[PDB]
Amino acid sequence: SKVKQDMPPPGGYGPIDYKRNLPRRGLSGYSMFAVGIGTLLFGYW
Amino acid sequence: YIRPGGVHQDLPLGLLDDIYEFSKNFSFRIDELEEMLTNNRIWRNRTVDIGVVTAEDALNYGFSGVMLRGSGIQWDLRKTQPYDVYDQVEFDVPIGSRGDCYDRYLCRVEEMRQSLRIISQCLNKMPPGEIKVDDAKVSPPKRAEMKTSMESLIHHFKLYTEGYQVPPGATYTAIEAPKGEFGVYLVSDGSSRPYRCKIKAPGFAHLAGLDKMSKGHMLADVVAIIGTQDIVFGEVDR
Amino acid sequence: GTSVKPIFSRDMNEAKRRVRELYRAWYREVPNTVHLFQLDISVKQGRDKVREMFMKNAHVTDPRVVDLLVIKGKMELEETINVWKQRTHIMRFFHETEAPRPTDFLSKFYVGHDP
Amino acid sequence: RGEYVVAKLDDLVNWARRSSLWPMTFGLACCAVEMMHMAAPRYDMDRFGVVFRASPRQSDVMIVAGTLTNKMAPALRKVYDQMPEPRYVVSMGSCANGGGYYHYSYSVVRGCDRIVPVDIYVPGCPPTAEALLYGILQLQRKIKREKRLRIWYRR
Amino acid sequence: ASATRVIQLLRNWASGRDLQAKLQLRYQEISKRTQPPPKLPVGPSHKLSNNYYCT
Amino acid sequence: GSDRSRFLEGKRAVEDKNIGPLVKTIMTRCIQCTRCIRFASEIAGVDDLGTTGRGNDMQVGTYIEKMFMSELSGNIIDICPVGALTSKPYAFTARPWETRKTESIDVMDAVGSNIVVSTRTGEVMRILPRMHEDINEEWISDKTR
Amino acid sequence: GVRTSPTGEKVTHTGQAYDDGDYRRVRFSDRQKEVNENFAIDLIAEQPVSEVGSRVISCDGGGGALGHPRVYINLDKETKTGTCGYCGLQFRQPHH
Amino acid sequence: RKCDPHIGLLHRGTEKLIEYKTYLQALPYFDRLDYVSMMCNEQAYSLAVEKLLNIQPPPR
Amino acid sequence: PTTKPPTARKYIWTNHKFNVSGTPQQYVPYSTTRKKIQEWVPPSTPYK
Amino acid sequence: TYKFVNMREPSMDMKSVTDRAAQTLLWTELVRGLGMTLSYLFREPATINYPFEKGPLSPRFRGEHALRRYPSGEERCIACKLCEAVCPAQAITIEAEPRADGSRRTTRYDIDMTKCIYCGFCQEACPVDAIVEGPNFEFSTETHEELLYNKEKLLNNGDKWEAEIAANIQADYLYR
Amino acid sequence: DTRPTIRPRNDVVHKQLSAFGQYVAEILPKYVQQVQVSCFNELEIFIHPDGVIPVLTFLRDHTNAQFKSLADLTAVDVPTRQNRFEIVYNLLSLRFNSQIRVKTYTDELTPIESSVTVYKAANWYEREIWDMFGVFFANHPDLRRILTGYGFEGHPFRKDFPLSGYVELRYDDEVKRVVAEPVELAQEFRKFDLNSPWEAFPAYRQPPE
Amino acid sequence: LHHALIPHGKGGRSSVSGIVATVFGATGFLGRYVVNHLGRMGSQVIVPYRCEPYDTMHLRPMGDLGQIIFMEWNGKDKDSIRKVVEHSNVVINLVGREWETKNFDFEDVFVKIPHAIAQVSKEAGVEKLIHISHLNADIKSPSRYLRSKAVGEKEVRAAFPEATIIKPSDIFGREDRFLNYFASMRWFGGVPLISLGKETVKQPVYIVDVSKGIINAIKDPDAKGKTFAFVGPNRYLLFDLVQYIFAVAYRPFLPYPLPHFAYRWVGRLFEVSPFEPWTTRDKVERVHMSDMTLPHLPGLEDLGIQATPLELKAIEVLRRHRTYRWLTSEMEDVKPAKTVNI
Amino acid sequence: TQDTQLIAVDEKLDITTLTGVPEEHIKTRKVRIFVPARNNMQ
Numbered sequence A: 001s002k003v004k005q006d007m008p009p010p011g012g013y014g015p016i017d018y019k020r021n022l023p024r025r026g027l028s029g030y031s032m033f034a035v036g037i038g039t040l041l042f043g044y045w
Numbered sequence B: 001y002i003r004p005g006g007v008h009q010d011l012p013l014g015l016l017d018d019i020y021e022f023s024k025n026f027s028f029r030i031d032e033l034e035e036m037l038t039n040n041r042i043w044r045n046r047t048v049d050i051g052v053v054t055a056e057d058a059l060n061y062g063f064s065g066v067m068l069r070g071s072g073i074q075w076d077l078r079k080t081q082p083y084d085v086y087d088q089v090e091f092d093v094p095i096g097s098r099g100d101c102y103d104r105y106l107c108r109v110e111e112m113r114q115s116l117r118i119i120s121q122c123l124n125k126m127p128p129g130e131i132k133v134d135d136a137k138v139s140p141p142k143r144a145e146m147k148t149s150m151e152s153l154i155h156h157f158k159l160y161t162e163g164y165q166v167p168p169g170a171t172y173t174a175i176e177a178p179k180g181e182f183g184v185y186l187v188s189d190g191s192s193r194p195y196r197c198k199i200k201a202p203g204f205a206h207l208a209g210l211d212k213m214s215k216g217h218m219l220a221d222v223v224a225i226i227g228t229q230d231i232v233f234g235e236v237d238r
Numbered sequence C: 001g002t003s004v005k006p007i008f009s010r011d012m013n014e015a016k017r018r019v020r021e022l023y024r025a026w027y028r029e030v031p032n033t034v035h036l037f038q039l040d041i042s043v044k045q046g047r048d049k050v051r052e053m054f055m056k057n058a059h060v061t062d063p064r065v066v067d068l069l070v071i072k073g074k075m076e077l078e079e080t081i082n083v084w085k086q087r088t089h090i091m092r093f094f095h096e097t098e099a100p101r102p103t104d105f106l107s108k109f110y111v112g113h114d115p
Numbered sequence D: 001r002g003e004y005v006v007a008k009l010d011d012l013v014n015w016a017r018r019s020s021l022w023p024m025t026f027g028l029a030c031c032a033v034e035m036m037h038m039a040a041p042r043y044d045m046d047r048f049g050v051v052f053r054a055s056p057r058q059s060d061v062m063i064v065a066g067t068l069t070n071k072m073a074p075a076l077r078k079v080y081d082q083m084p085e086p087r088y089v090v091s092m093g094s095c096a097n098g099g100g101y102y103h104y105s106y107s108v109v110r111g112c113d114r115i116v117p118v119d120i121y122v123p124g125c126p127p128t129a130e131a132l133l134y135g136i137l138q139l140q141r142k143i144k145r146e147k148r149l150r151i152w153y154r155r
Numbered sequence E: 001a002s003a004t005r006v007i008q009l010l011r012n013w014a015s016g017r018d019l020q021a022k023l024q025l026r027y028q029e030i031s032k033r034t035q036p037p038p039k040l041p042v043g044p045s046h047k048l049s050n051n052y053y054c055t
Numbered sequence F: 001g002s003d004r005s006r007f008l009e010g011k012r013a014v015e016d017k018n019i020g021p022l023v024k025t026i027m028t029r030c031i032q033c034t035r036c037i038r039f040a041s042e043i044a045g046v047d048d049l050g051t052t053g054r055g056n057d058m059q060v061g062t063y064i065e066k067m068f069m070s071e072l073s074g075n076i077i078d079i080c081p082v083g084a085l086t087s088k089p090y091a092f093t094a095r096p097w098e099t100r101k102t103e104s105i106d107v108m109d110a111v112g113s114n115i116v117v118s119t120r121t122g123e124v125m126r127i128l129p130r131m132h133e134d135i136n137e138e139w140i141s142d143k144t145r
Numbered sequence G: 001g002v003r004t005s006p007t008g009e010k011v012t013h014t015g016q017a018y019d020d021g022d023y024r025r026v027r028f029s030d031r032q033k034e035v036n037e038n039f040a041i042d043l044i045a046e047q048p049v050s051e052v053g054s055r056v057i058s059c060d061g062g063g064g065a066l067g068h069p070r071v072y073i074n075l076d077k078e079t080k081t082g083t084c085g086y087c088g089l090q091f092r093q094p095h096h
Numbered sequence H: 001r002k003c004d005p006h007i008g009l010l011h012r013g014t015e016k017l018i019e020y021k022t023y024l025q026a027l028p029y030f031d032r033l034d035y036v037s038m039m040c041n042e043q044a045y046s047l048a049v050e051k052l053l054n055i056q057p058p059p060r
Numbered sequence I: 001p002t003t004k005p006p007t008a009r010k011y012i013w014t015n016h017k018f019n020v021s022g023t024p025q026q027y028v029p030y031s032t033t034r035k036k037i038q039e040w041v042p043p044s045t046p047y048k
Numbered sequence J: 001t002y003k004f005v006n007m008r009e010p011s012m013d014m015k016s017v018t019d020r021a022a023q024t025l026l027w028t029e030l031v032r033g034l035g036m037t038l039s040y041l042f043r044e045p046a047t048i049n050y051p052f053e054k055g056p057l058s059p060r061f062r063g064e065h066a067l068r069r070y071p072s073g074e075e076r077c078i079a080c081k082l083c084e085a086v087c088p089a090q091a092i093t094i095e096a097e098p099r100a101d102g103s104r105r106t107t108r109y110d111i112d113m114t115k116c117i118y119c120g121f122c123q124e125a126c127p128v129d130a131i132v133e134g135p136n137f138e139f140s141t142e143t144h145e146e147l148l149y150n151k152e153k154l155l156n157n158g159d160k161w162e163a164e165i166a167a168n169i170q171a172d173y174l175y176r
Numbered sequence K: 001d002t003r004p005t006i007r008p009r010n011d012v013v014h015k016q017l018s019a020f021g022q023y024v025a026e027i028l029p030k031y032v033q034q035v036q037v038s039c040f041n042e043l044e045i046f047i048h049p050d051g052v053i054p055v056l057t058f059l060r061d062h063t064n065a066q067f068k069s070l071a072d073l074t075a076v077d078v079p080t081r082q083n084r085f086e087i088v089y090n091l092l093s094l095r096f097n098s099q100i101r102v103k104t105y106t107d108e109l110t111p112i113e114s115s116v117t118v119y120k121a122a123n124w125y126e127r128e129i130w131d132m133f134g135v136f137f138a139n140h141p142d143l144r145r146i147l148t149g150y151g152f153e154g155h156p157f158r159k160d161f162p163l164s165g166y167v168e169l170r171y172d173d174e175v176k177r178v179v180a181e182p183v184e185l186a187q188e189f190r191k192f193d194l195n196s197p198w199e200a201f202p203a204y205r206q207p208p209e
Numbered sequence L: 001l002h003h004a005l006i007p008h009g010k011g012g013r014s015s016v017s018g019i020v021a022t023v024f025g026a027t028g029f030l031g032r033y034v035v036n037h038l039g040r041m042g043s044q045v046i047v048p049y050r051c052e053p054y055d056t057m058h059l060r061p062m063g064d065l066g067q068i069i070f071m072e073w074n075g076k077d078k079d080s081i082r083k084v085v086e087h088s089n090v091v092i093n094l095v096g097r098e099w100e101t102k103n104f105d106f107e108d109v110f111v112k113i114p115h116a117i118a119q120v121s122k123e124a125g126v127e128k129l130i131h132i133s134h135l136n137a138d139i140k141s142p143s144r145y146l147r148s149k150a151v152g153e154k155e156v157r158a159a160f161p162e163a164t165i166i167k168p169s170d171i172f173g174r175e176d177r178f179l180n181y182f183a184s185m186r187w188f189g190g191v192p193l194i195s196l197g198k199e200t201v202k203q204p205v206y207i208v209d210v211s212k213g214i215i216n217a218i219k220d221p222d223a224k225g226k227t228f229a230f231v232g233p234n235r236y237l238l239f240d241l242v243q244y245i246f247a248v249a250y251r252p253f254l255p256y257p258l259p260h261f262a263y264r265w266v267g268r269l270f271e272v273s274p275f276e277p278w279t280t281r282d283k284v285e286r287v288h289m290s291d292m293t294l295p296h297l298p299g300l301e302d303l304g305i306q307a308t309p310l311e312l313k314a315i316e317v318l319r320r321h322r323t324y325r326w327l328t329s330e331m332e333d334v335k336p337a338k339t340v341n342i
Numbered sequence M: 001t002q003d004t005q006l007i008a009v010d011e012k013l014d015i016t017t018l019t020g021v022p023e024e025h026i027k028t029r030k031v032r033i034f035v036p037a038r039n040n041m042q
């Protein structure tokens, strides 16, 4: 019986992500302002 | 677990895979932390520009670790004084520009990502080898050899009565703790027991800075100073 | 080798000097420490407590040590003035709970093998 | 019957108190962190009463976690008297139980019994986080076997 | 795992991330708790010859 | 000494010679240093023990069964470098690190032999013959130990 | 075999038995002493004696590494069945 | 303006007992030194002791 | 255990107890050693 | 190698200022924080249902000392007292005596539960694997005295568990 | 160093500290008694008591030494030696990644002018020394009992101070307050005589003194 | 002494003094202090408890490991006593209810149980017994407090030949319901006491002086049979208590000499509350009655315990009643009461 | 050789008052020395 201690597989392991991957979600700066003004004008009317 | 002369026990079968399972997903949770804390204006305006400390004042106050690196100082124990195999692994040292509580907070979370990198390399670098030194005068002989051979019986017997005979002298072997610089002044008379072991407390100097980091600042900033220092009441109090 | 470095007391008088205002401050200290700390101790037995402490150690003649108790007594006073010390600490000097240790050889004998 | 009436009232009061303790944290050492994992979702305690109201005045049971020091001795004690009854204290870990690993030391009083009346003892160094949940549960059943209104009826 | 589809897209949208790809609870990737006998290696100096403690 | 073993064969076990209700013999542990036989014939001046056998099978003992009975018979226990000869009454009672040796003198004889007391936790376990040369050297008789 | 004292106090294998006059018996009423009923003296006594035809017999005690160190047992005493100090298992030399 | 972080409220004379114990029994003190990063303290103690001992740990 | 019964042995408890504390089945510490300082048991009858 | 952290530069162009002004007025990173928590609301909890659900452990768990016995029946502890010497808290109190049979047996084996630390040193001490730390943690008490264990309790604990701890050391003595 | 048991030695820096040790020794020979290095590449230069100011002011300000990181202010009691208290400094050089260590000798009474000027980190350490070992330091801004209990007696790390201490504490009902009675241990510290009477290391053996 | 009953130690917590003082009904006032004194030098004080263990929990800290052995007991059960005093080498009685209960007729609390524990203790094989009587114990007095005390006092005297009976005066302490009582007329009303206080002289005694008396009586062998009276240092006419107590607490002094006729009515109305009879008809004439000198029986002064003056320690019990504006006031600001005494 | 206002201390040093040991533990404590006798079995 040869060495049987806990060993990683010969290919090591799956490449594990470690970067900061904050997904940029949102809307255009003017788009947010435009839709805000549009609702106000509709509400006023 | 980590004992003088190696490590006590061996890794249980399959655990390295479980470490990979945890590591593969822990990056997601830190994206959750940074999104929740870093970007939010409440976290910045309450914690940024709070408790600043100049580089010369920081270092000359005996500060270490996140105290120095966050406050501009360019120094890390593993990169500069390579102890153990830390030289072989690769990582980055996330130093800061200003050095307030927020900058230290970001320095901590970037070291977390860097910690994941070090975990990745070492876990794939696991060797075939024994867990403790092949010197029965410092390392306990194997339990199979315990009940098989006389030398092993004596060596474990004496190691478990008085321990091992440490050559006299003194040292200040110091490594970076995840909080700061942790060291010990272990002076040995030469018997089987230590003579005097003064433990460097990484927060000992860090808690000394509470005077100025809270000076000129609000009362609520005091706990912010403590929080970004992460004062743990086991070392500053021996 | 008899000639050694002194701390503050170059002579006996300066050691006698520092003891003076130390008692001056401490004599002015007893009535209020009782008052703020809500100690059920009258001022009088607070004052002479400082008194017999003062000559419980006023026998040594070395000038290097006498001023060391001066600063030790000096700073035991500082810790008291600013409510750092609590009720247990002030009372701790006022020994209460233990029975008087034996006085005659009859009492040493009756308690136990202790001398 | 009268004994039934005092039994129903005893159950109503006991069931309320045992099921909704409001512990106040007095962690001093590594015994604090492992109880503080009971707050972590793995062994959630807020599932049964014990909640974040804290405010040592608004507290039923006090958990003394970690080593107890002589300079810590009076300040911990005066907290206990200010703690309104029914007040019970939980002894966390070998250090708070009887001094543990620092029993022969000058800056630690061996055990919390010398200071406060300990109602329950949880061994460990540190006790596993779930083991305290058991200790809280066994304290909960300890309240269940209380006869305050029953003993008053006998009087 | 667990959850249903329409819930997943709800939390996928609110977090801006694909949580189903990797989660924070172990379901089946965990290694089997019982494991084969771990035959450990020997010491580097484990040899019947030329291994005196004089060296 | 080394830090491992190189022995793969079996061992040898010796029959325990039974002598005295005061000294215990485990002859398998004997290293055949013969210190017992010399401290017997020269010091005690009595013929009691031998080295019966030859080679690996030579054994320290009396051949024919006896009971070695000298006044200073309780001294070979200390001269024995191993536990081949041990003290029966103190046997299996206390161990070195527990004991806090305290020195005194013997009273059972007018000699006043310097001795070492072995209090462990509030009671006396064994008596050691403190070395002083003139009064008792480092040997004490049985009635004192 | 656990034995009881005159006051009904069962004795332990060490032999401790608090007498009636002992004030230290008051912790015993309303509660109990835990007594290891399996008295270690007589779960070895009933164990038989194995027969091995050799002058020296190993005494690993089974279980391989799970046991006691293999102290070798001398077997030449006809009047004394050689037992192991570790495990107490009596070993015997065939009756010549 | 002025801050004094008084300490001692947890103080244990850790190295006072370290003197009376040997190195192996001293090891659990270090794990209890920092109750957050425990094994890092074990790392410092083990490095210091095996630095004096002139013995290096195996690569595994 | 239905698929793997534990190693059956004589001294193993045949019935697993719960936490006996609180019940009259608690545990009480007591010396398991024997007294080693016996008195003189003064004999009776005569007078000096 | 190294890396800064707070070295991002804010762009002064019309586009960049608009997003920052929109972020300040129309709180978006705050809403991003809201979305993070809400997505977690619909995330299943990980609350183990004690006592019915119990947290995972490993075959190496340390707690609740219990002397074992040989397959014959005699207890393992030969009073070799390495556990006493090793015990870093001196919680062990062992007094030896020659038993009537002749082999040793401890007449006094008290380990003070509230001095012990469950470091697992004691099992590594005795070469007869006499004392081990079992898998129990469910021995919280209400009086300080019952924590003070003795030889009788230790044997009773050993006889109580034995079978569970019998397999534990069988699956772990290879590592040791 | 083909054998993996012993740690390899490093000679290139080993000679470097000795060269730097002589470099410091020649500059200020008025205060350096003796300088030496150990096997584990740790140099120590030994200073006279009244030398706390300039030697550290040297290492803190020298363009070729510039040791500014104050590591620890330890003390080591040696009852045999007349100046039993041995105050030990420790400095780290940021640019030259080295660890200097200077230590002095001091009696119970003899002071040391506070080195808070060269390193204000010593200030908070300085409180501990007078608490922990009891050595008073001259002209110290505020040298306070900061880590031991309030109103403690003596210095616990003097090797004449019992491990258990002198006073134990308990809550007393008749005073409704914690009273400090003299210690009365439930169990006595079972000291262990752990000293093999055979020679441990022929290398570091003390010759007949 | 018995093999293990022999004393040992320096009087610490873990020092065996060899006195096994099973105290009866220690869950209140004097029980709390005596066990505190009993546990100081170390003693197996077996306290039979009958209430909820929670209320007895606070007796635990004043005992070493395995010292305060709470034991379940009931007054009616004959075997209840026999189990708790079987091994106790000394028995300290403290049973008695200063107020009244329907199930506990006032005869019982000083006649039935005190006799019900004295005879079992003498049958068990004890050495000593201390039943606490009253300094004014007198059956012929209209005080049921005194009426039940005296008859029970001689019963245990007759039953137990070595019954060292203690007759303390009106003890005062943190929970004496005597000082905190006398502060409570301000809360209740206009001090409805009788004759403005100029009809009753009493001699209060500080509890520690009392409790030190029993333990000193424990070590004293000649105390058997002798009936010691525990008396304070000075007497005090009843009016002096009222003005001094209202002074050391800074309370609005509103004295009123309400005669005994109407003051007896308020006693029953205080018993009306079916939770605790704040004041009883027994307590009506209890304070009106004055303390007899009783000079022939020996006192604690010859026993080695001196007497602490009342005015030496009043706010230690009365600072609680002092309002926030005057909680800081000590004795010195307050004039001492007129020492109407010997 | 150390000339800074040195005081010619001719009386033997007595630091007993600084260490603050209890008074019953400085007089009623015979303190003794000797060099341990070798353990005769070793």
Ligand SMILES: NC(=O)C1=CN([C@@H]2O[C@H](COP(=O)(O)OP(=O)(O)OC[C@H]3O[C@@H](n4cnc5c(N)ncnc54)[C@H](OP(=O)(O)O)[C@@H]3O)[C@@H](O)[C@H]2O)C=CC1
Binding pocket: L024, L025, L026, L027, L028, L029, L030, L031, L050, L051, L075, L094, L095, L096, L097, L098, L104, L109, L113, L132, L133, L134, L135, L167, L168, L169, L170, L171, L172, L176, L178
């Ligand atoms: N000034 C004074 O008050 C003086 C009082 N005394 C007498 O001293 C005794 C003790 O005084 P003190 O400690 O202040 O009183 P407390 O009311 O504070 O305590 C009385 C004790 O008696 C116990 N007790 C009484 N009757 C019973 C019963 N039937 N069954 C069980 N327990 C019972 C109570 O137990 P539980 O709490 O469970 O009911 C309690 O422990 C009383 O008899 C008192 O009258 C003597 C001289 C002066």
Ligand code: SF4
Binding pocket: D029, D030, D031, D065, D066, D067, D092, D093, D094, D095, D096, D099, D100, D101, D124, D125, D126, D127, H032, J117
């Ligand atoms: S019992 Fe153990 S874990 Fe708890 S405080 Fe003490 S040493 Fe730390």
Ligand code: SF4
Binding pocket: F029, F030, F031, F032, F033, F034, F035, F036, F037, F060, F079, F080, F081, F082, F084, F085
């Ligand atoms: S002294 Fe001991 S080891 Fe030496 S020969 Fe005699 S029995 Fe054998």
Ligand code: SF4
Binding pocket: B154, F029, F081, F082, F083, F084
């Ligand atoms: S202790 Fe010494 S004599 Fe005894 S068995 Fe071990 S090696 Fe042999």
Ligand code: SF4
Binding pocket: J083, J086, J087, J088, J089, J090, J091, J092, J111, J115, J116, J117, J118, J119, J120, J121, J122, J123
């Ligand atoms: S686990 Fe450690 S502390 Fe506990 S009894 Fe074993 S050796 Fe002693």
Ligand code: SF4
Binding pocket: J076, J077, J078, J079, J080, J081, J082, J083, J084, J094, J122, J125, J126, J127, J128, J129, J130, J131
């Ligand atoms: S170490 Fe093991 S064999 Fe030795 S005394 Fe302790 S329990 Fe028994």
Ligand SMILES: [K+]
Binding pocket: F076, F077, F078, F079, F080, F081, F082, F083, F084, F085, F086, M041
């Ligand atoms: K020998």
Ligand SMILES: [Zn+2]
Binding pocket: G059, G060, G061, G068, G084, G085, G086, G087, G088, G089
């Ligand atoms: Zn065997």
